[PDB]
Design a protein around this ligand. Structure first.
Ligand SMILES: [Zn+2]
Ligand SMILES: [Zn+2]
Ligand SMILES: [Zn+2]
Ligand SMILES: [Zn+2]
Ligand SMILES: [Zn+2]
Ligand SMILES: [Zn+2]
Ligand SMILES: [Zn+2]
Ligand SMILES: [Zn+2]
Length: 514
């Protein structure tokens, strides 16, 4: 009931077996399988040469080279394109034809992921992997000298390896689900939209991030390539000459070269390149016509970022004023000028007449950031996916479970990335740090997620679920709200549709100013 040495395209791989319980269940764990060669700075990934004998996949390998926590140093290595696999095993035979879920992490467009709980509770295979981030993942001139999107190609290389090789581990290669959060959710979305993945992906889950979020596509890469070159001493007059100089700069200097609202400081991210991303992502959804799709957000997703743009929200000691909010709103709506700043300010502060409390005003700032960074882009992606669906199902969720006491006792919510610990079963892996109801939420999310992996239907699979999750259509606009106490009223509809319509209809029709 164990895997032993596993035959892959590159050679034999040996993992470890961890016995779970006393009746014969276990899990096979593989860490550090290479899926591409050691990377070259600002060059596309390459096949990894095969190896002789048996590769011992016992330890996580280094991550890709990236800036530390205080932007003063680096960690990781150029030899970083590795993946890890968790295979659950029963008492009788070794597993076969299991659904495969590939996690793409986020954190680099705006750390420890262990697949054991999802795999064993959901009877699926979980894959994690590294891709290149920052300047080394996304530096670009916008043309063929330095086309960008290296990190997206890394992700695609890992998915293609899984398609070629996972059957030997007991996986079904025709049933691959991608799932990921923040940048990883946006990357999941971008992978479903790229022609590169045709035939590779069965379904996908975007958590707090889609290709349409405004922090995903850099439309002025050449401006950012120049700021890096000028700091590392490269010339900036020619594209082909700056690019080559960047390609032979110390990769640590490229990484540390670079250290107004938070969104204006999104730099080294995917670009529309005419190749991996052939067009604006909004025009690509026919590529996902047959990829089942969950997308969702957290109901306080924007709170961390509103806190950076306006620290006054996190202390009843200080106040947020109409003038502070107008300034924030005005910088987001610049391309529509004074007129666009006012219509937006007016719509969001309409409730301030009846409720002028700092609780309501500070909540409005959070809602504004949640809407424009996460919720509205996600609602547009759901509609776009639904509109282009042939066989694909579409599902929407809102994650609202609090993990901690709020600033105001009515700010019941989940902040950005709060969803990860529940999806990954941390309340069961380290239960002393968690409450009973936390395990209730985690149990339900793993059930929905891995049912969806197995069948494309979050309600149908190996696990019972608390409430029926109705597929999204243009007519029902339904979403599942995920809380510690779920029942039939957890299926809701029309989330903040007045603000959806404001952004998609009213704001779009206003003239562009210069
Ligand atoms: Zn190697
Ligand atoms: Zn090295
Ligand atoms: Zn089979
Ligand atoms: Zn991110
Ligand atoms: Zn390819
Ligand atoms: Zn901001
Ligand atoms: Zn918070
Ligand atoms: Zn139904």
């Amino acid at each position: 009931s164990k895997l032993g040495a596993v035959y892959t395209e590159g050679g034999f791989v040996e993992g470890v077996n961890k016995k779970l319980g006393l009746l014969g269940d276990s899990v096979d764990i593989f860490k550090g399988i290479p899926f591409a060669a050691p990377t070259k700075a600002l060059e596309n990934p390459q096949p990894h040469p095969g190896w002789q004998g048996t590769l011992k996949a016992k330890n996580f390998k280094k991550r890709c080279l990236q800036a530390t926590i205080t932007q003063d140093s680096t960690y990781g290595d150029e030899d970083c394109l590795y993946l890890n696999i968790w295979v659950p095993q029963g008492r009788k035979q070794v597993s076969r034809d299991l659904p495969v879920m590939i996690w793409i992490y986020g954190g680099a467009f705006l750390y420890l992921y262990d697949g054991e709980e999802i795999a064993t509770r959901g009877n699926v295979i979980v894959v994690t992997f590294n891709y290149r981030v920052g300047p080394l993942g996304f530096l670009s001139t916008g043309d063929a000298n330095l086309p960008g999107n290296y990190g997206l190609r890394d992700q695609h290389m890992a998915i293609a390896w899984v398609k070629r090789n996972i059957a030997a581990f007991g996986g079904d290669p025709d049933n691959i689900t991608l799932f990921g959060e923040s940048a990883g959710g946006a990357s999941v979305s971008l992978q479903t939209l790229s022609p590169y993945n045709k035939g590779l992906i069965r379904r996908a889950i975007s958590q707090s991030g889609v290709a349409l979020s405004p922090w995903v596509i850099q439309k002025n890469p050449l401006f950012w390539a120049k700021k890096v070159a000028e700091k590392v001493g490269c010339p900036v007059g020619d594209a082909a000459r700056m690019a080559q100089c960047l390609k032979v700069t110390d990769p640590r200097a490229l990484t540390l070269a670079y250290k107004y609202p938070m969104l204006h400081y999104v730099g080294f991210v995917p670009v529309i390149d005419g190749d991996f991303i052939p067009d604006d992502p909004i025009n690509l959804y026919a590529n996902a016509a047959d990829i089942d799709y969950i997308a969702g957000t957290n109901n306080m997703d924007g709170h961390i970022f509103a806190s950076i743009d306006m620290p006054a929200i996190n202390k009843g000691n200080k106040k947020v004023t109409e003038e502070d909010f107008y300034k924030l709103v005005s910088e987001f709506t610049i391309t529509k000028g004074l007129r666009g700043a006012k219509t937006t300010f007016d719509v969001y502060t309409e409730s301030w007449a009846q409720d002028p409390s700092q609780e309501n005003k500070k909540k409005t700032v959070v809602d504004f950031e949640t809407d424009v960074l996460f919720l509205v882009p996600t609602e547009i992606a759901l509609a776009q996916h639904r509109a282009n669906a042939k066989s694909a199902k579409t599902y929407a969720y809102l994650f609202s479970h609090p993990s901690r006491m709020p600033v105001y006792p009515k700010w019941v919510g989940a902040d950005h990335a709060d969803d990860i610990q529940y999806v990954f079963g941390k309340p069961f892996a380290t239960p002393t740090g968690y409450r009973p109801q936390d395990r209730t939420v985690s149990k339900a999310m793993i059930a929905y997620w891995t049912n969806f992996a197995k069948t494309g239907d979050p309600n149908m699979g190996d696990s019972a679920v608390p409430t029926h999750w109705e597929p999204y259509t243009t007519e029902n606009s339904g979403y599942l709200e995920i809380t510690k106490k779920m029942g039939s009223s957890s299926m809701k509809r029309s989330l903040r549709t007045n603000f959806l319509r404001y952004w998609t209809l009213t704001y779009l029709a206003l003239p562009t100013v210069t």
